[PDB]
Structure 1
């Protein structure tokens, strides 16, 4: 009968009661947990059954307390961190945590020695300072995350807390070994080796096990429990093997492991990711509750029997001196900490000083001091002082840090946040009123008590010099609410320009969030884009500049130089000889009785002298030249016998390990180029959307023209920069574009699965099976080759949209092509030359310049389609920016190919479909901009459409109700009203009943229609050989009874 189950479950119940009853009170639940632990301890001191339970649990071993509770707390502190904002300010957090912890521990040790009447030496006082310096603020981080801005202050506090806890336990272990458990003497070299071993091989062991855990988690599909148990066992095994077997700091190993696992969250499935977040949060809550209950019981049972009024006075002076020492530390490191990318103000310094909440880590270290000290009074004084400092810091610092965040002005809600929240609350209230008016006239839910319904459905506003600022912001908007005609003033013009810039930046932020939520952007690209947007909005009347965005896709650094050097270094037999290399390696580890069986028969006669040097390299480089050096040293074949194997193994394994380093460098460049491509695509799509919605927002034409000009210059610069980024690293760009294409197709297939599930056509289990299939495909896409080689120019002709499936047409076009090589020619297409053929771009970035449309098209885009199809002089001049290789299929060959292949969907039809999609995207994007359509949604809606064959219509077309949008592509059309034939290509107005195309000089005007999307679904199978490939063939969904 284990009493530990009673104490653990009772502590869980007491923690639940403490969390439930103290929701509204500012006192944390840990303080009343300590109070309940003290009450349970004095009850156990009176009653013997509670004495039995708390004796079996609260008087625990110190090492089992550390090995159980420290990995959970340290791993959750590392795993709950936002690692991107942590690594962006890693230098400041690192210098503050490390050096401030060292100097605060030294100052607390000096304070303890000079003030405390107990005759502690410097090692026990340094242990006291190491316990006191460890801060665990969670309420401060929660308040900083909740109270709007200063998120970077919260990440600074959390990262400094994590590194401070790790280094505090490290120096605590060092001085605890100096005081209590050994007392062994050592030389200076052993001390240097011990310091190097701890402070280096802690993080190195954590890094190694973290890389092994990430590699194991990447190759696990469709079993969550394996991933969760891999994470838990990796954490506990890392801490145990580091602390016990390797005799290294296991706390830093779990810090590094948690930071790396939180960094590579893409190797975990998202459902397993949110489960791991909530599970480690629950585990840390369990560990904190157990630690606080045990601390309260042992404080009121053992630590409170030796305490005087002088000890209480020392506790008060210790609290005051600890706060003063932390403030002095932050003030002295403030000149260093100001000159980083995120400097500290005085308000952030005050919040960080008052945010030093002592937590469960210092309580656990005081518990292991008190259990290690035995019957000596030092452990009792340690435990009493640590418990008192924890109680005082928790109560006073939590309540006064809520009050201080209110006082200092860091808790006020910002004006755009208040505007957005008020607009959201108004929209929710209008929707609730419409839903209430719909439900009041229902068949069933009509006699409900609507007073109770309106009382319950009453979601309200959470937020319930500034007056002059709002007066300026309201006088800057003489809009639709005030219909007064006037003329602008230069002060009024400056105010209108500032307001237009603010509206453009706000709408760009809206476009970035719209890109993120539907999903084109990543999280970090979205954060960078909104950071640049708010930085441009705050300062100096400037828009979002191209340089700060350009800092994202600047790929240069250590990694491209390493890639170039390794690719200069390089230029089943090899697998077999590598297996032989490792099979030689393990004898060296065994060598370093019968003299070890004659040194395993002279290493199996040097493995029959490396299998006669792999049959002389199967009867055969400079790599082989130093292999011949190893060969002649083996021909010499006791120091030389030991040295030869060790010199053989690494020199032979270098050839194997170089391309793995090439793959690692390619992966790092792949990650950086993925971030740069995501930032560039997000800016381009946001600028396109904000240019399509700028006519409504901006009223003045001069400001409209200026904003459009600066937006289009920024868009063209970013497009050209991304084209040059593609030209820089070809294989890595091909790999990231392949990854993004596979991810987009799989996301749209998942959307199709959810659509067919929600329409009822598929049941829940089969939809779950298909979702499992696409999730397995996504996770296998996550671990992909990051250096996919570029396709040949012959393969780029096969995968175009206007010839994809027709193999005979592919053979014809490939047989009669012409691969040209233009080098800065700028004579591809002129403004008024006759059509002479197409130009399929297979390499380089062209520059379009014509009527003023400017664009930089790239590989895959076809040039000359309009001129070849319409038999007209060309539209725009196309130049070359970087050595463009076109595929010049001539006009006569194109006419022969059009006349020849027509039994299929015709080549003329495919070319007209491609140019109809290309000419029909901006019209639909211009019409349906305000309804909330992105460019990708418009393109996918256009892709469902088909060109109308006018042979059956005989130049008379009717607009039915099934057609959603009609776009005339090339020419004119009359109608039943026949007011005027439409001169230019544009979307047909939906009010027009019919279209009357006319026969003219030969153009034959193509019209593009998109019909709206359309439960019996009767299908026919057929049995085949072996009676296993029985499959439905004729899915119809259009039958008779």
Structure 2
């Protein structure tokens, strides 16, 4: 009865999809044609009719209740939400208003043109049933070509809103026409429509938040998440369908959008499996419904064949294209007025794009089957089948021509040269590997002609004067922006940036590239991270100011007692026992209030509210029983902490992105100067570019520091989160290196990987994002301070705390080095001889003045009320004299300042090409310095060391008698290093032994 048709439909869909991949037309039109010829055969041969009747004439209710929600949820689950939510207002207003105007114009045109005796409800049904779309076919081509991501996102996100609101309009009008017994009074109808509008999406959002909350607490598991997510989706659909007739699909689409939004709380394997499963289900539904529409349109087309009917179909297709063009043109200036308008080229390609799909045919078969023995269903089905096959041929065939006529199909010259370079490098490497393989013992037998023929990759992208000064400046600007984009991509690949920050940086860089003589401004980035101050911040401040046997479990039990007491009154809003347990609960709350009175009753407002509620409880009968429930309001004093935590989480989510953007920009600017130092020629050009980059760096650093200063309760959390993520990433890299080296077996490596993944997932939702730091922990947390509690106590006894107001000056250039400084709260500016910098909490000032005892070379200007920790120089000297263990503290000072003074030198020499700041820092950290006292102030360079750098002292080469000042790198030319008894300038070296 059923099995033959479904198996044949799956086979035919498989064949057509696998065979029309290269062809331009989509695979669906040939599916429709196969369904048509199957319908002809079933009309002729009775056995095919017997095997077709049970599924072609399907009960329309199961169609409208099963096939539609799967398709809508798939189209919801398909995309990303960030691009959608970033441009939600545009697509929402466009979809809604275009849909309603298309429906009404198509309806009135049907009245004016068809010469049928159709009432208004049928005409609105017609307009709403040919307004559904399916941009899948095109959006795939647009994403493949990659002309514009915003256009593809807009044309693909129009689909959901269009289909959902078309379904809703169809549902209300179908209930109006085919079920006449339903009352069409104004008040009930508007109440029902408002219910559809609000009760659907809110219910979907509620269940989405509930299931995300349950899902975030499941660790190292996969089978639980899949079943609970599928159950959540199905129960949302079932509840939505039980309460309302049509709001279920809206609840499902909003649930899908939200559960796709919170991607970080689901393991990647679970989400990729879920995407694949929903996609397979949708594809099966699509194939089966197209078979069904083909057979049912063939079996019922001989009763409505008419030449003027074909003329009506043709002019209807022309009319609907015209109407879509007209509404897009009408809304183009209004959409341009919002600051996020679209080009006319985008408008025309998007109105010619977009075409009918499976949704229209689903609703059409619903109409046809509900119509029964009438011509109205045949007219509906014939018209919609004609328009869908017509657009599936015409638009999906000529869309490539429309792309090629306009400038969208063109490929940028930089992308072409990138392709040429990449393919040349790939070809050269493959040729080199082939030459190497031809020299081996084992593989010389293989015939290399077929071998080389088999392996080949082609090109997918091809088959003095002031005017001279301006041209050189433009060339430098272009290469500047290219190098900055390269650094951004490299740093994203290594993994210190989130995807959103990289997308923002790339968009800003390409916008600056498109604009003439415009660099990357900071004002746009300032607006990017300056979303901190919004009405949520005012709400947080208000909530902070409203809030202020003593175990926490006491009030926890009070809250759960209130929760259980909710049930009897909410059932009332058995009587004798209910009153008795009410009396028992009243007595329990009375003794709880007595205990609270024993705790000095210091509560301000909740005490008054509890007193009022107790007065009500201890004290027209129906009204009193209805209004004796204000005790429900007592839970809000426990609901406030949850709200302040969630608003803190929100502000954390914003601040993390804003912080990452600044960090990526500052790293890129730091590296690109050393990039351009190897390239630039004109002195004025390099001076101007360096000045501009330094100005941007200073502005960004100062603004970010002030933003951190504004409220540290979130900056502390986000910085700790980033630090722990970095540590776990490097531990995972070390684990994989050990696995590749073979020293760790595969099972143990998998166990270690599992532990690391568990730690990272615990990180993903562990902190409350509000850790307050104390200053003494900051003093004891310094790198060289750590490792000796005795030295920590000595410093803490000998440290001093100073406080300064805005605009003051702490130390000036050339003054005597009174001691080492340690900033513990605030922000400060450091200006000294040309260069300028900004220092924040967690740094120290002036290690030269306490190690080399040289005069200061900077000036310190306070920017806010700063708290600083101060150690006198003589105390540092006596601490150096006291502690002389193997990890000597002064050795730690020299190591730290050596790293800080050697990283810029290495990056200037650019010795480690393709290395970020982190890798160079780690490589220099692996090294250690060795004392020259035990080696007679002579050092021999061996092959074990990789890089050597001298920090202080005068380097005397044993051979050739070369005198080298400090600090600078020494190459492999020097073989022996010699020093004498130079107490005035103590020599200091640094070596990096390789393995």
TM-score by length of 1: 0.91
Distance 1:905 1:564, change over 3 A: same
Deviations 1:347-399 (A, max 9, x none): 11111111121011111111221222222322222222212111111110011
For residues 253 and 239 of structure 1, the distance between their equivalents in structure 2, rounded to whole angstroms, comes to 7
Aligned equivalent of 1:260, options 255, 258, 261: 258
Query: Is residue 540–residue 644 contact of structure 2 (8 Å, CA) maintained in 1?
Result: no
Deviations 1:549-573 (A, max 9, x none): 1111113443543444344344322
Distance 1:633 1:929, change over 3 A: farther
Query: Is residue 525–residue 678 contact of structure 1 (8 Å, CA) maintained in 2?
Result: yes
Helix, strand or coil at the partner of 1:433: helix
Instruction: Compute the displacement of 1:81 (Å).
Output: 2.0
Query: Is residue 674–residue 910 contact of structure 2 (8 Å, CA) maintained in 1?
Result: no
Deviations 1:956-975 (A, max 9, x none): 11111111111112222212
Deviations 1:563-611 (A, max 9, x none): 443443443222121112111211222112xxxxx63645445353534
Helix, strand or coil at the partner of 2:947: strand
Query: Is residue 148–residue 413 contact of structure 1 (8 Å, CA) maintained in 2?
Result: no
The worse-fitting range, judged by mean Cα deviation, of 771-780 and 562-571 is 562-571
Distance 1:338 1:245, change over 3 A: same
For residues 755 and 40 of structure 2, the distance between their equivalents in structure 1, rounded to whole angstroms, comes to 59
Instruction: Compute the displacement of 1:96 (Å).
Output: 0.7
For residues 599 and 241 of structure 1, the distance between their equivalents in structure 2, rounded to whole angstroms, comes to 32
Distance 1:971 1:188, change over 3 A: same
Distance 1:128 1:819, change over 3 A: same
Query: Is residue 540–residue 647 contact of structure 2 (8 Å, CA) maintained in 1?
Result: no
The worse-fitting range, judged by mean Cα deviation, of 647-656 and 490-499 is 647-656
Query: Is residue 819–residue 871 contact of structure 2 (8 Å, CA) maintained in 1?
Result: yes
The worse-fitting range, judged by mean Cα deviation, of 236-245 and 190-199 is 236-245
Query: Is residue 830–residue 874 contact of structure 1 (8 Å, CA) maintained in 2?
Result: yes
For residues 871 and 611 of structure 2, the distance between their equivalents in structure 1, rounded to whole angstroms, comes to 54
For residues 948 and 631 of structure 2, the distance between their equivalents in structure 1, rounded to whole angstroms, comes to 72
Helix, strand or coil at the partner of 2:559: helix
For residues 608 and 48 of structure 2, the distance between their equivalents in structure 1, rounded to whole angstroms, comes to 78
Instruction: Compute the displacement of 1:236 (Å).
Output: 2.6
The worse-fitting range, judged by mean Cα deviation, of 602-611 and 893-902 is 602-611
Query: Is residue 44–residue 54 contact of structure 1 (8 Å, CA) maintained in 2?
Result: yes
Query: Is residue 532–residue 655 contact of structure 2 (8 Å, CA) maintained in 1?
Result: no
Query: Is residue 532–residue 651 contact of structure 2 (8 Å, CA) maintained in 1?
Result: no
Distance 1:52 1:924, change over 3 A: farther
Instruction: Compute the displacement of 1:545 (Å).
Output: 0.5
Gaps of 5+ in 1: 466-487, 593-597, 1014-1041
Query: Is residue 912–residue 920 contact of structure 2 (8 Å, CA) maintained in 1?
Result: no
Distance 1:646 1:735, change over 3 A: farther
Query: Is residue 176–residue 184 contact of structure 2 (8 Å, CA) maintained in 1?
Result: no
Instruction: Compute the displacement of 1:628 (Å).
Output: 1.3
Helix, strand or coil at the partner of 2:364: helix
Instruction: Compute the displacement of 1:126 (Å).
Output: 1.0
Match of 1:983 in 2: 965
Instruction: Compute the displacement of 1:647 (Å).
Output: 4.6
Instruction: Compute the displacement of 1:282 (Å).
Output: 2.6
For residues 854 and 512 of structure 1, the distance between their equivalents in structure 2, rounded to whole angstroms, comes to 25
Query: Is residue 591–residue 599 contact of structure 1 (8 Å, CA) maintained in 2?
Result: no
Instruction: Compute the displacement of 1:41 (Å).
Output: 2.7
Query: Is residue 970–residue 985 contact of structure 1 (8 Å, CA) maintained in 2?
Result: yes
Number of aligned residue pairs: give it: 983
For residues 180 and 266 of structure 2, the distance between their equivalents in structure 1, rounded to whole angstroms, comes to 43
Query: Is residue 716–residue 771 contact of structure 2 (8 Å, CA) maintained in 1?
Result: yes
Helix, strand or coil at the partner of 1:848: strand
Query: Is residue 92–residue 158 contact of structure 2 (8 Å, CA) maintained in 1?
Result: yes
Query: Is residue 757–residue 764 contact of structure 1 (8 Å, CA) maintained in 2?
Result: yes
The worse-fitting range, judged by mean Cα deviation, of 168-177 and 449-458 is 449-458
Instruction: Compute the displacement of 1:640 (Å).
Output: 6.4
The worse-fitting range, judged by mean Cα deviation, of 277-286 and 688-697 is 277-286
Deviations 1:64-101 (A, max 9, x none): 22332223222221222232222222111111100110
For residues 165 and 211 of structure 1, the distance between their equivalents in structure 2, rounded to whole angstroms, comes to 25
Query: Is residue 693–residue 929 contact of structure 1 (8 Å, CA) maintained in 2?
Result: no
Distance 1:169 1:892, change over 3 A: same
Deviations 1:196-242 (A, max 9, x none): 10011121112112212222222222222332333333223222221
Query: Is residue 335–residue 342 contact of structure 2 (8 Å, CA) maintained in 1?
Result: yes
Query: Is residue 817–residue 850 contact of structure 2 (8 Å, CA) maintained in 1?
Result: yes
For residues 753 and 747 of structure 1, the distance between their equivalents in structure 2, rounded to whole angstroms, comes to 10
Query: Is residue 106–residue 129 contact of structure 1 (8 Å, CA) maintained in 2?
Result: yes
Helix, strand or coil at the partner of 2:275: helix
Deviations 1:490-538 (A, max 9, x none): 1100111111111101111111111111111111111111111111111
For residues 113 and 120 of structure 1, the distance between their equivalents in structure 2, rounded to whole angstroms, comes to 7
For residues 604 and 992 of structure 1, the distance between their equivalents in structure 2, rounded to whole angstroms, comes to 97
Query: Is residue 361–residue 384 contact of structure 2 (8 Å, CA) maintained in 1?
Result: yes
Query: Is residue 201–residue 248 contact of structure 1 (8 Å, CA) maintained in 2?
Result: no
Aligned equivalent of 1:628, options 604, 607, 611: 611
- Backbone CA RMSD of aligned residues: 2.2
Instruction: Compute the displacement of 1:930 (Å).
Output: 6.7
Query: Is residue 566–residue 658 contact of structure 1 (8 Å, CA) maintained in 2?
Result: no
Distance 1:855 1:608, change over 3 A: same
Instruction: Compute the displacement of 1:916 (Å).
Output: 1.4
Helix, strand or coil at the partner of 2:939: strand
Query: Is residue 826–residue 879 contact of structure 1 (8 Å, CA) maintained in 2?
Result: yes
Query: Is residue 617–residue 628 contact of structure 2 (8 Å, CA) maintained in 1?
Result: no
Distance 1:247 1:968, change over 3 A: same
Query: Is residue 67–residue 239 contact of structure 1 (8 Å, CA) maintained in 2?
Result: no
Aligned equivalent of 2:389, options 380, 387, 391: 391
Match of 1:784 in 2: 766
Deviations 1:979-1002 (A, max 9, x none): 433212122223321221332124
Instruction: Compute the displacement of 1:130 (Å).
Output: 1.0
Instruction: Compute the displacement of 1:63 (Å).
Output: 2.7
Query: Is residue 674–residue 736 contact of structure 1 (8 Å, CA) maintained in 2?
Result: yes
For residues 627 and 499 of structure 1, the distance between their equivalents in structure 2, rounded to whole angstroms, comes to 74
For residues 410 and 781 of structure 2, the distance between their equivalents in structure 1, rounded to whole angstroms, comes to 56
Query: Is residue 67–residue 240 contact of structure 1 (8 Å, CA) maintained in 2?
Result: no
Distance 1:750 1:370, change over 3 A: same
TM-score by length of 2: 0.95
Distance 1:310 1:861, change over 3 A: same
Query: Is residue 805–residue 865 contact of structure 2 (8 Å, CA) maintained in 1?
Result: yes
The question of 1:305 aligning with 2:294 is answered: no
Query: Is residue 821–residue 885 contact of structure 1 (8 Å, CA) maintained in 2?
Result: yes
Query: Is residue 736–residue 786 contact of structure 1 (8 Å, CA) maintained in 2?
Result: no
Match of 1:1004 in 2: 986
Query: Is residue 563–residue 666 contact of structure 1 (8 Å, CA) maintained in 2?
Result: no
Query: Is residue 205–residue 253 contact of structure 1 (8 Å, CA) maintained in 2?
Result: yes
Instruction: Compute the displacement of 1:44 (Å).
Output: 3.2
Match of 2:714 in 1: 732
Query: Is residue 239–residue 254 contact of structure 1 (8 Å, CA) maintained in 2?
Result: yes
Distance 1:275 1:882, change over 3 A: farther
For residues 777 and 564 of structure 1, the distance between their equivalents in structure 2, rounded to whole angstroms, comes to 31
The worse-fitting range, judged by mean Cα deviation, of 735-744 and 942-951 is 942-951
Instruction: Compute the displacement of 1:740 (Å).
Output: 0.9
The worse-fitting range, judged by mean Cα deviation, of 440-449 and 119-128 is 440-449
Helix, strand or coil at the partner of 1:698: coil
The worse-fitting range, judged by mean Cα deviation, of 648-657 and 913-922 is 648-657
Helix, strand or coil at the partner of 1:297: helix
Deviations 1:312-355 (A, max 9, x none): 22221221111111111111112212223331222111111111
Distance 1:921 1:53, change over 3 A: farther
Deviations 1:455-498 (A, max 9, x none): 22221111219xxxxxxxxxxxxxxxxxxxxxx21110011111
Distance 1:298 1:559, change over 3 A: same
Instruction: Compute the displacement of 1:131 (Å).
Output: 1.0
Deviations 1:8-36 (A, max 9, x none): 33322211210121122111101111112
The worse-fitting range, judged by mean Cα deviation, of 562-571 and 624-633 is 562-571
